[PDB]
Amino acid sequence: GVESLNVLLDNRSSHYEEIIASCHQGINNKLTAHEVKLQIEEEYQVFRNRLRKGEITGQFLKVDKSRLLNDFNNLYVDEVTATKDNIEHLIYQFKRASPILRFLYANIGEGEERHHTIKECQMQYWRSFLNKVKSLRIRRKLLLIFDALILLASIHDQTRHKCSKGWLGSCFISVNDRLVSLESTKRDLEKWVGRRQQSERPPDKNQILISMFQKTILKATAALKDVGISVEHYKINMEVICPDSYDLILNFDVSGVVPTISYQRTEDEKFPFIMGGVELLESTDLERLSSLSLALVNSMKTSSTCKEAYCQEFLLSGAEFQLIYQKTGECSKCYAINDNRVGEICSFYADPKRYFPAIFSAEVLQTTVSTMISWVKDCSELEEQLCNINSLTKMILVLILAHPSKRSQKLLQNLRYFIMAYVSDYHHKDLIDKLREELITDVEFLLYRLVRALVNLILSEDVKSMMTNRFKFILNISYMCHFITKETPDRLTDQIKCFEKFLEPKLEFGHVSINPADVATEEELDDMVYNAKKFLSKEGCTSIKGPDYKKPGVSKRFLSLLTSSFNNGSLFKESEVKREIKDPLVTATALDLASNKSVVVNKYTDGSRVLNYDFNKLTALAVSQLTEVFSRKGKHLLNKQDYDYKVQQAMSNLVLGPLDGGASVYFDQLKETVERIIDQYNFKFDMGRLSDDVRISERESNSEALSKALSLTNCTTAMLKNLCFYSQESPQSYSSTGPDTGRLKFSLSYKEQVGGNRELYIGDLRTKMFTRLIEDYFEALSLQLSGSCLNNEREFENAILSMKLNVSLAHVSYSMDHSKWGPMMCPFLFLATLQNLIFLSKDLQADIKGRDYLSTLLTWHMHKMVEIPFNVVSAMMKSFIKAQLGLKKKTTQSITEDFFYSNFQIGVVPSHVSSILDMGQGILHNTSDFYALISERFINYAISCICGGTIDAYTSSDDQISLFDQVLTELMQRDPEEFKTLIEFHYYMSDQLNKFVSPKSVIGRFVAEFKSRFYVWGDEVPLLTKFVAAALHNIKCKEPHQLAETIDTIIDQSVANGVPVHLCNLIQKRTLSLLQYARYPIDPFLLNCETDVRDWVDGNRSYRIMRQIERLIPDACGRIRSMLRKLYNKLKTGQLHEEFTTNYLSSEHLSSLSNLCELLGVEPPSESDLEFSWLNLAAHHPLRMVLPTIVKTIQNKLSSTFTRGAQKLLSEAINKSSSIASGFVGLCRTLGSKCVRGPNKESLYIKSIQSLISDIQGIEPLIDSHGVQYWRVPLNIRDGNEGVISYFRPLLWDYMCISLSTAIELGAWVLGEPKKVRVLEFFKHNPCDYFPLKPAAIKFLDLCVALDVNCEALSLVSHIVKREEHYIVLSSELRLSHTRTH
Ligand SMILES: [Mg+2]
């Protein structure tokens, strides 16, 4: 599917050949393998001679540790002036930085009063009951009758044991976590009952209240009994309605501290309690932080619904505090902390999200800090000052967790580059200027001081004993950056930076074409030709001035040298000379485009498509938005006599209509546009219509776009060609710019990355099909050769082996990195390189045809159009319109803003941007990889033919590791002035080919780093912090059986790198505790929290559940565990194979199990062993997460090769249907609403099933220590009551079938005997030692296929369609493991 372009009518008259002539004029790609050496030698000679005198700059220095340390110490001396800070002062001032940090260390607490808090009175029960009633459907009447009952309950329960919990001053929380007063409600009730009494005018003032209360109670009970849930299980005392109720309310008195939140800075400088009394050694502050973070996260449940107040209670070591806020939704707001004994402890302005990683993780952090400290305790010279390290690490962790910012991420992230350059031999001089950020708040400077004090302590100039544990310590500290987030604080603020990045390098080159208009103008062609000519006019090392680094452009001489060298077979190894280069022209599916991405749809008002924005509508929208944002803010904080208010009021009086020494002309001419707009169509028109009209290219999802495109064809195959060249809407002829359907179009977006933010170009569908052809072509042609690791898997292992071998012999390594790889490449370079290669085959015609098709495709991509986001245009228009008659801000005028202004004050406004110096970021990956491979091979060959050494390369897109040989390493130690100039020539000659080296490169003899894989001599570097941070906040709003396997895979992957097993057990326990908060009945299938090391390296997922089940009921699986051995012995040989498949697989379960046990001459299981059962919800239909799967997956994988099957799959995917904390809130809310499917048709609850089980007095629950519920039921109740026993499932049958399947899928050591060995002696061990290990590696196939459908609790075949190769584990964790005989 490469030569299908011959179906269209060619039209390539005049524009096409000029570019070819420009790119093929002076490229002498015919040199031999003997002339290039002369040019290379002469270039080397002239470069060295010019460098010796000093007309060229080096950009490479020799490492000196003292200067590096001093420069790091003196890195921020403009606001933080100091020389050395004492640890005691840092500790003293750390506990008093911010209210959040001051609250976690105060001396708070109270005896028996805190013991009463372990009890719940008759006040919260009524609150929960009324919340449940209000959840269903049954207006001030309801609120009054609902918040009076809880008041009555509190009054009743305040005269029995003298306790008042759930109060604040004179306020009480009633229904929606609200805060309501006392007197106002009393008088409202009095007036409402007075109106009732007036309407009734024998009845008394105490009878109407009880009558209405009982009228509501019966309706509530009927409503709860209608669905199927009981009412008497809530434990509510109905006697709270006293006979004398009306007079009870009106004679109540109470006294307390009146609460009030603050909004300024000077109101939080008064602290009631002691400012600090907690030591860092214990884990007291972590529990408080966890509770506060949970309270903050829970603050998003509130719906829309004096004025308002919302509250959330939380306990702390007996005490009870309340977090109060005054605005709903999910965004930045004001929070205050209150108590009932004092008032307004503190107040802050935190954000509800970005607070997930600390919810129930209070012992994982302590353990990881302990295991990080345990890495350096064996240093003789670092014995005295050991507690300071622990304290500093604790402060760093607590500070990063308590104040999640974005500029604190870039500070801990850059320490890795410094520590990599510390143990190296050479480094770029522009390295210090790269480790510098812009800090604003007073907290980040404290973090910088803390990390500086820690680095100056760990890396002093008098300790050289280990020199390996400190490296791991610093590198793992630098990886705490992953603990915060990967989201973005704002949206508009981070959308202008991307546009400025996109437009910055394209303006200096002086080539910015704004509006192509889809019919190219003569000036556009002339400018494109001139820029193409200019792009190939780079000179260097042979001129009057010399080279000019860091500029876009390519030299003709080096391009000719590269092409000639490639065409002579001089860049090939000894294995490629045994064959001939193949052309993939003659040697795919379209459903791939249905992936989980986005797409853009066009819009036509006529035969043509709109491409330009309107001017008057944009002005009207800008004025409307300014008035909208003004109406509230400028009405309060603007002086009436001020000019700004006087002019903004006039501006507001232009659209709504409910001293001019400034811009009189502008204000006089702006009236007409608004008047015409309002005449042409509480505003005076429709905002929605205007917003829809101004938008030109709305977005749309991916699946339905493909479905609607496919639903108008007549081909019975799902191929790429059938959707593009054959349709009712297909191009007829194609021209120089593009097909008659129009030129290509893209749109801009940003990714979500830790640190910076990458670009993203998202195109339409036609471009999506067009790109894949070139993508696949270049991918195959690069796969022909060896050297690329972008998609390969084995060469990555080969590179790892090479790195290990190089490090083992102390050879020199070079870790590289290229900058601006995306926004400064060009498709013209690819076209010019393609037009000079010789894919030698004995067929000229096919080569010419393929080259022509590739050339025209590259030309099509050369004339692409790029869209400008709507929000950026709106913001720029607001800035222009406001700062033309007003004087509001006018602070900074960036060079990227005058570009909008100059075009604004000419008439039409910018719509698109087109140019030549931009390559699609993440679009043409394979072409760039292939070019990089060729260029690196040529550079290595040149360096080889200059000096007497050889160099390797493992380039992958933009990354590189280079491994020098022995000769270069020996040369580096005896002639530094030669090695340095060789490096200089390498840098210059790499720059000459449009490849720029970043200042973060390393030339080291101690560590190698390729794709974030550090290697040293002997030891290994486990990124424990990265894995822990990734595993912490990695849950979504899925069904609770997919999260278990999602976390299990992550833990299995992380175990194989060096993480101990106790951390994994704690993480799994935290996950189970998080699930328990949602009140989900745990089954013995989710997770196992007692795994040893053999359960991760030898056993698979199915073995851990087997081990967990083997512990719940012992002495009952032993009988089965020998019948299974006999069955395996008689089945592997081929004895029976008949009745087990049909007479024992599809029948009654218990009877068949007993018969199977009896048949093999083995004692049948005891009668009191089949009584064990477990509850399995959704045993009939799957749960409703939104408000046989094996055969269906096989169908979706095979029948989707045609049109109808693919369409059905797309329809089902469409009919399937923000944050991480929002996902948790959604999971908590959804799991508990209905989440139940009935037998025939209905929706039920979870509480109803529990009530039904509690009703029958024959079922007994059993709980494990961590908590896994499993039931015991008698055989006599096996049937007769089938209403609820349907959901239960037996235990021994599933255990047997899963054990048999696991024995089939692995060896036979599983059915041995578990004899946990622990009689081994003791040893003072070291936490730094590792041992590589390997895994434990027809009728059986269809046997497993048939067995898969019966025991439907897991999906074993799902895990098949990766498998880890080697496992690296400690030595002390490898001994104490279970052992089993064959
Ligand atoms: Mg790298």
Ligand SMILES: [Zn+2]
């Ligand atoms: Zn009480």
